[PDB]
């Protein structure tokens, strides 16, 4: 058992993890774009008469109200879920890491070699 490859292995694992994170971000963005296209259809603005624009914007406004309802719903959901996650994280820390927050220290530094100076 050598400490030699500990550094290399942890650096390689960090590189792999970073690649996974950036790839997951890119694929989430692509899926989001696809779901957006299939939800909000792409805007067509060709050869349209004014009445056609009126009707299309009316449909769009009805959809706007509907999606606003959906999204304020999911926004309240995400807010409540974030709050609950934070609360349970702090509870878990209290159960496990509350005894360790005081232990975070920067000690035994100056007084070690500051005794004979007097």
């Amino acid at each position: 058992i050598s400490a030699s490859r500990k550094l290399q292995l942890k650096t390689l694992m960090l590189q792999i993890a970073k690649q996974e994170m950036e790839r997951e971000a890119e694929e989430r963005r692509g899926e989001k774009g696809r779901v957006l296209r299939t939800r909000c259809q792409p805007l067509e603005l060709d050869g349209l008469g004014f009445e056609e624009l009126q009707d299309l914007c009316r449909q769009l406004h009805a959809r706007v109200d509907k999606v606003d309802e959906e999204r304020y719903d999911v926004e309240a959901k995400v807010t409540k879920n974030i709050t609950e996650i934070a609360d349970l994280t702090q509870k878990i820390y209290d159960l496990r890491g509350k005894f360790k927050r005081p232990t975070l220290r920067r000690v035994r530094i100056s007084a070690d070699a500051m005794m004979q100076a007097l």
Partner: protein, 371 residues
């Protein structure tokens, strides 16, 4: 920038920057004017030696503590002590550093308001905050519950805390502390022939108390043993020779803590005011307080106190509960370590009393939301 965690105390001023393990400068809080006439000219004789300088020239001074029992009785001397602490022991101007003083529970308001007014007007700090001396000692232990007995040198107070919610109706503050033990030791030493009277010799009696006295596990058995054998008589060399021999004065001086009737005080000892402080709490948090009894403060450093107190409480408490007494080796600086931890927290960074707030509401801001 970094915060200054000062801790006035009564007997030893402990200070240092936030985020370390131990206070940077610890020195007695005494200010002693010279009392004789002085004949050498140009010797550079000052008018008042403060701090650790007056513990070396104490032969010709009249030392007088500026803090009697938690409260501050002589504001000019306390201002002098603070000025010394900031400028000579730490060498950091206060114009660029927040300060975190500490105060005993149940102290007069005027003391706290004057303290904040001084810190904001004379030293002109950016922001200062005053904290109760027991919550810090609970921080340092890394707990979040427990009942802490902080037997300092001025005043002994016993603050119970559960889950971070302090119980204000269960604080039992008792004014017996290290200074009264020093006076009682100085009074019982006269039974062998040694008379200490001068305010300078009180320091010698304090050194005797620190180095020799210990708390007996059982008082009557020790009194009987010391009266028959001579295995207890420990000798000590005064600052000039003439060694002295302390007999059963060794465990009779700190016994006053558990029987305050020795110095004429009516109240019950530190072994029974803790049990009373627990019994005032609710019926469902008594087990946790029993299991997490915390000791702090200087005077709880007597060899053998963590066993005597546990025996006494186990005698008082119900037989089923487990009694555990937390006595960390870093007891003396426990309050200051806790103060450093509290000042180093990010969540606490917005609780300071900012100067503009003081300018708008006056010194009475300390009793307000910014506690």
């Amino acid at each position: 920038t970094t915060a200054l965690v000062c801790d006035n105390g009564s007997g030893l001023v402990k200070a240092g920057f936030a985020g370390d393990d131990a206070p940077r400068a610890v020195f007695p809080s005494i200010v002693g004017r010279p009392r004789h006439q002085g004949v050498m000219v140009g010797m550079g004789q000052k008018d008042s030696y403060v701090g650790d300088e007056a513990q070396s020239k104490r032969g010709i001074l009249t030392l007088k503590y500026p803090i009697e029992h938690g409260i501050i009785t002589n504001w000019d001397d306390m201002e002098k002590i603070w000025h010394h602490t900031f400028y000579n022991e730490l060498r950091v101007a206060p114009e660029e550093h927040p300060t975190l003083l500490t105060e005993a529970p149940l102290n007069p308001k005027a003391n706290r308001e004057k303290m904040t007014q001084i810190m904001f007007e004379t030293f002109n700090v950016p922001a200062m905050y005053v904290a109760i001396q027991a919550v810090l000692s609970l921080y340092a232990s890394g707990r979040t519950t427990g009942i802490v007995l902080d037997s300092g040198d001025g005043v002994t107070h016993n603050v119970p805390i559960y889950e971070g919610y302090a119980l204000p109706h269960a604080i039992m503050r008792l004014d017996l502390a290290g200074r009264d033990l020093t006076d009682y030791l100085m009074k019982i030493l006269t039974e062998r022939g040694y008379s200490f009277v001068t305010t300078a010799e009180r320091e010698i009696v304090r050194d005797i108390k620190e180095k020799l006295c210990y708390v007996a596990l059982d008082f009557e058995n020790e009194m009987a043993t010391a009266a028959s054998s001579s295995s207890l008589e420990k000798s000590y060399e005064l600052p000039d020779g003439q060694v002295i021999t302390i007999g059963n004065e060794r465990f009779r001086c700190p016994e006053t803590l558990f029987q305050p009737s020795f110095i004429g005080m009516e109240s019950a000892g530190i072994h029974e005011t803790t049990y009373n402080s627990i019994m005032k709490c609710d019926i469902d948090i008594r087990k946790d307080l029993y299991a997490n009894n915390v000791l702090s403060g200087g005077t709880t450093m007597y060899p053998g106190i963590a066993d005597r107190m546990q025996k006494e409480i186990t005698a008082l408490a119900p037989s089923t509960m487990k009694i555990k007494i937390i006595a960390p080796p870093e007891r003396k600086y426990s309050v200051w370590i806790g103060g450093s931890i509290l000042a180093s927290l990010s969540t606490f960074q917005q609780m300071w009393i900012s100067k503009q707030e003081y300018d708008e509401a006056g010194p009475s801001i300390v009793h307000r939301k910014c506690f």
